[PDB]
Amino acid sequence: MSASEGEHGGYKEIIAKISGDGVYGRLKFESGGHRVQRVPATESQGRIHTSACTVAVMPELPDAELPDINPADLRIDTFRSSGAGGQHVNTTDSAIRITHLPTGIVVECQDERSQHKNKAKALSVLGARIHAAEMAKRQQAEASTRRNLLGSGDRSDRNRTYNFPQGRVTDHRINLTLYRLDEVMEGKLDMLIEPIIQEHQADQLAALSE
Amino acid sequence: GNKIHPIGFRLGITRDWESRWYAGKKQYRHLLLEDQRIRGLLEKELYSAGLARVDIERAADNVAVTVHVAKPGVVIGRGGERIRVLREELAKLTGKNVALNVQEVQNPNLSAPLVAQRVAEQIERRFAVRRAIKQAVQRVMESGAKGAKVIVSGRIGGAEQARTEWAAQGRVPLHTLRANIDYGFALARTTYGVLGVKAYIFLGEV
Amino acid sequence: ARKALIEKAKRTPKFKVRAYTRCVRCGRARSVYRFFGLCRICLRELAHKGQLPGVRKASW
RNA sequence: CGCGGGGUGGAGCAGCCUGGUAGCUCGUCGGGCUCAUAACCCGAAGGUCGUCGGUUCAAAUCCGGCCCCCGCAACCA
RNA sequence: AAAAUGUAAA
RNA sequence: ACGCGUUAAGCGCGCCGCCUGGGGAGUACGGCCGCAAGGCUGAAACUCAAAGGAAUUGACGGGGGCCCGCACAAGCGGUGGAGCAUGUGGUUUAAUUCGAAGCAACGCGAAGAACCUUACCAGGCCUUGACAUGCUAGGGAACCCGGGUGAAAGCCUGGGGUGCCCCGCGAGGGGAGCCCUAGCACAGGUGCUGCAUGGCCGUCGUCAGCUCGUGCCGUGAGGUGUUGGGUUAAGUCCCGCAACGAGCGCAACCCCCGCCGUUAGUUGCCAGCGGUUCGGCCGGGCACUCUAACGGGACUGCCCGCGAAAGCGGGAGGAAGGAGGGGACGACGUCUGGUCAGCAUGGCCCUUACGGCCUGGGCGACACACGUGCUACAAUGCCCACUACAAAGCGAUGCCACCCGGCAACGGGGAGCUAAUCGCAAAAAGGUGGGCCCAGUUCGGAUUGGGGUCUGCAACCCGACCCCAUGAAGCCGGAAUCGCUAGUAAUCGCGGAUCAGC
Ligand SMILES: CN(CC[C@H](N)CC(=O)N[C@H]1C=C[C@H](n2ccc(N)nc2=O)O[C@@H]1C(=O)O)C(=N)N
Ligand SMILES: [Mg+2]
Ligand SMILES: [Mg+2]
Ligand SMILES: [Mg+2]
Ligand SMILES: [Mg+2]
Ligand SMILES: [Mg+2]
Ligand SMILES: [Mg+2]
Ligand SMILES: [Mg+2]
Ligand SMILES: [Mg+2]
Ligand SMILES: [Mg+2]
Ligand SMILES: [Mg+2]
Ligand SMILES: [Mg+2]
Ligand SMILES: [Mg+2]
Ligand SMILES: [Mg+2]
Ligand SMILES: [Mg+2]
Ligand SMILES: [Mg+2]
Ligand SMILES: [Mg+2]
Ligand SMILES: [Mg+2]
Ligand SMILES: [Mg+2]
Ligand SMILES: [Mg+2]
Ligand SMILES: [Mg+2]
Ligand SMILES: [Mg+2]
Ligand SMILES: [Mg+2]
Ligand SMILES: [Mg+2]
Ligand SMILES: [Mg+2]
Ligand SMILES: [Mg+2]
Ligand SMILES: [Mg+2]
Ligand SMILES: [Mg+2]
Ligand SMILES: [Mg+2]
Ligand SMILES: [Mg+2]
Ligand SMILES: [Mg+2]
Ligand SMILES: [Mg+2]
Ligand SMILES: [Mg+2]
Ligand SMILES: [Mg+2]
Ligand SMILES: [Mg+2]
Ligand SMILES: [Mg+2]
Ligand SMILES: [Mg+2]
Ligand SMILES: [Mg+2]
Ligand SMILES: [Mg+2]
Ligand SMILES: [Mg+2]
Ligand SMILES: [Mg+2]
Ligand SMILES: [Mg+2]
Ligand SMILES: [Mg+2]
Ligand SMILES: [Mg+2]
Ligand SMILES: [Mg+2]
Ligand SMILES: [Mg+2]
Ligand SMILES: [Mg+2]
Ligand SMILES: [Mg+2]
Ligand SMILES: [Mg+2]
Ligand SMILES: [Mg+2]
Ligand SMILES: [Mg+2]
Ligand SMILES: [Mg+2]
Ligand SMILES: [Mg+2]
Ligand SMILES: [Mg+2]
Ligand SMILES: [Mg+2]
Ligand SMILES: [Mg+2]
Ligand SMILES: [Mg+2]
């Protein structure tokens, strides 16, 4: 659903949603850093190189919107508008202000000579100003949690090494170290992910049963 | 790598066939692979003596193995025992009536397949690989050759990224087929790894 | 399966078709002559040492 | 509500008046060049024209209404 | 008197 | 060091200015000046393990000069388009075994994948084993035999062969080569690592280069020689020289091909003859072709011209002339090149299993893409017959002239040959009459149908030929690209290596 396929090779960057059963737990362990030592394709004399990548698989997020506000808390406010207007403005409370109590946002509309139109214009600007505003809280968390997760700098970033000139993949966190590799590099990922999951759980019980 | 074997080169221009015998079409391969197994046995029990050359020739069944050594007090054995028991092991695994034909080297430091074997164990026993050459040629040249060259290859007592170095003195016109020369491998088989000692003596363009 | 197949290319078969060539000296299967019972290299190799009768380098 | 504007192969533009007429530029995929990439040369791929319903024998097109996008007055003494 | 570039390990 | 050298950067002295690692910085701050633009004076924090000066060695240049390469030019024939062949990517799948990656991976290791080969796959089995030295041993006894299960391998299973040192009155002799049966050393690995290696190759490149010795120059890395003039395919020479020589290379010596002869005189040969019985068959003869050893032949050796020398440029005669053409032959080195899977080899691993065996599948898969390649579009061509002309090779496993069966491949009958004797044997183009008349064709021969031969235990996957129906795309190929300078390209045929068969 998003991809930057940078000249050669790759994919400089790729996003994709995986749909099915148990998609989380069977890839929720991949998030982190992936060191790789081989002689790159970009190379002109037999030198090995320690490049790397950042896996960041985040779960599914269901999202929300009640059919808008609680008019029971809402504080409406009529008052004489401020400015130039004379007898049908100094003498006509055409200005509105509305206040959402449990959140805290206040908006007002001395925007137009009506009142009903300023009323609604307030009650849909404050539509955005509450939900379109809270969507920041969504992204802020998304962004921050992906950043801690993905891990920034590289090569020193642990988790899993893929050594090609010896054909040995090692996962650091639970310490598998099988010199199979490539088969996983074909797709056979399991002679690897299953070890960590048991290992992950082995100490899971040692938490409130310890 | 490109330089070709100096023997197979003059194979019929100077040096001779180690095997000197005629054969029929469906019998060549039979009394070959049998007859090659002889030098397999001979090298197993004559390195201790100086096996530089074998001349395995054949009559009708009748073989005539003639060996060339350093100082054949080895094949002498207890008076005449190894000369016996070898011919007693020669025919013993053929079916064919063999012979105790044996002869020796005039001067040793003038035989490549010999000169090498000295070195490739001299260093298989650790010794200074450089000066084991510069003096090796120097023995050969004080042994009145016309030229000499020695080659080792692989981990020289160390150096993981292994090297191939050499020293040589005198004349060594390989590309000239006229020249009588001499070549023989030898295998350095040390703890850390295995090398390979080549050797060349130019004896005189006959 | 190394040795277990040079020893089983020499053993008596189950048919006249499971019969096949094996380099007696090296152990090849492809590029093994009938004339020598040899592989292209063992042929090549020993030849240079004159240990193969009458065969000199060709030139014509 | 009210006036008027444009929605069309992934991006950006013609084709609407005058009713049968998918155009250009990138971009894309696939062939070359080059040690390699771009540049560059050579072929192809790709949209029921916002959307309901409309009139004609047919709708990019003529035609009414919400769905969008966009300038858009609303003077309120 | 034509034409850009080559990351990061001896 | 480069260089300076009475026009000092020499040897001396007097006096001023200035420097004390790179960046930060000629900045910031303060002061001074200026219309402004700016100028003068001029720090530090931080930061790095260097910045820099000359000089040597190479590499590199969209620098020069001088040569060369089928490099371009000149010319002829291709691929890129089609269909098939085979190879690789991809994808794929139970696996689709591994490795090769720009020239220098891609009809590559494969010079023979149905089983085999076989490393892959699935499922049946194996546990001191398929193989090697051995050990204690329940006991043996070469072993011909023989049975039920199952796809086989294997689990089980019933028969004694009653032999084998040396003497058992004897009723046990004990041992023994192999052997069965347990157990201790075990083997076994195509498992990883060519970036731990040997060996062998590939390549720039058969390029004309690389160096060493002493001497000499230079504080030194280093230079000199190897540079320069001519010259050649060439570090090939000749001259010249602070050089004199030396090694590795090029040439050269070696092999086919061209000329000539000595020799050899069948199983080949046939000019003359008897022949004649229709004739190289008989006698006949090595004279010629043939075969295969030993040889000569060319040396700028001869002449006009040019240079001092090397050498060059022309014809002369000669089969051949400045290297006559062709092969083999790959310098110190480079590429962290290829190969642990041919093999060897230090490590690391696997040990009722990565090892060991058989059955079947797969290595031949097809939404796709490039390599090498066969076959074509046709009239210089396609078809039917008559019909000549080769050459290197192959085989008493076999090569199969022959009659027979036939539409055929083939089949059954066999005569020779251990092969200069007898076979594979028609070499195709070509030649000669017919034949077609310009069309998706009597081109082209893909695709598929029905029926057959052949070899294997057996052609579903998955074989190669034979016969009849089927007769596709293709009407000369975009961009681009490829081979090749004389018996060469082009085009036609034939043989062999691996090989049951292909
Ligand atoms: C305001 N003026 C001058 C006009 C008159 N003399 C003064 C005046 O106040 N006129 C304003 C008075 C009311 C008028 N007005 C407003 C709303 C309404 N619904 N109807 C109206 O007539 O808009 C007028 C307008 O702008 O001329 C200028 N700016 N020149
Ligand atoms: Mg990126
Ligand atoms: Mg789902
Ligand atoms: Mg206001
Ligand atoms: Mg307003
Ligand atoms: Mg979150
Ligand atoms: Mg590797
Ligand atoms: Mg580790
Ligand atoms: Mg010596
Ligand atoms: Mg196996
Ligand atoms: Mg428009
Ligand atoms: Mg138009
Ligand atoms: Mg590159
Ligand atoms: Mg373009
Ligand atoms: Mg209208
Ligand atoms: Mg220009
Ligand atoms: Mg320009
Ligand atoms: Mg002067
Ligand atoms: Mg100053
Ligand atoms: Mg100062
Ligand atoms: Mg400083
Ligand atoms: Mg500065
Ligand atoms: Mg200050
Ligand atoms: Mg001022
Ligand atoms: Mg210089
Ligand atoms: Mg010029
Ligand atoms: Mg010049
Ligand atoms: Mg000139
Ligand atoms: Mg070219
Ligand atoms: Mg043409
Ligand atoms: Mg491998
Ligand atoms: Mg492969
Ligand atoms: Mg057993
Ligand atoms: Mg007795
Ligand atoms: Mg007894
Ligand atoms: Mg008795
Ligand atoms: Mg390594
Ligand atoms: Mg060089
Ligand atoms: Mg010079
Ligand atoms: Mg000079
Ligand atoms: Mg000089
Ligand atoms: Mg010169
Ligand atoms: Mg010289
Ligand atoms: Mg006679
Ligand atoms: Mg005569
Ligand atoms: Mg005569
Ligand atoms: Mg000559
Ligand atoms: Mg001369
Ligand atoms: Mg002369
Ligand atoms: Mg003259
Ligand atoms: Mg002439
Ligand atoms: Mg081994
Ligand atoms: Mg098993
Ligand atoms: Mg097996
Ligand atoms: Mg035509
Ligand atoms: Mg026959
Ligand atoms: Mg014979």
Ligand SMILES: [Mg+2]
């Ligand atoms: Mg005619």
Ligand SMILES: [Mg+2]
């Ligand atoms: Mg047609």
Ligand SMILES: [Mg+2]
């Ligand atoms: Mg078939």
Ligand SMILES: [Mg+2]
């Ligand atoms: Mg053409």
Ligand SMILES: [Mg+2]
């Ligand atoms: Mg044949």
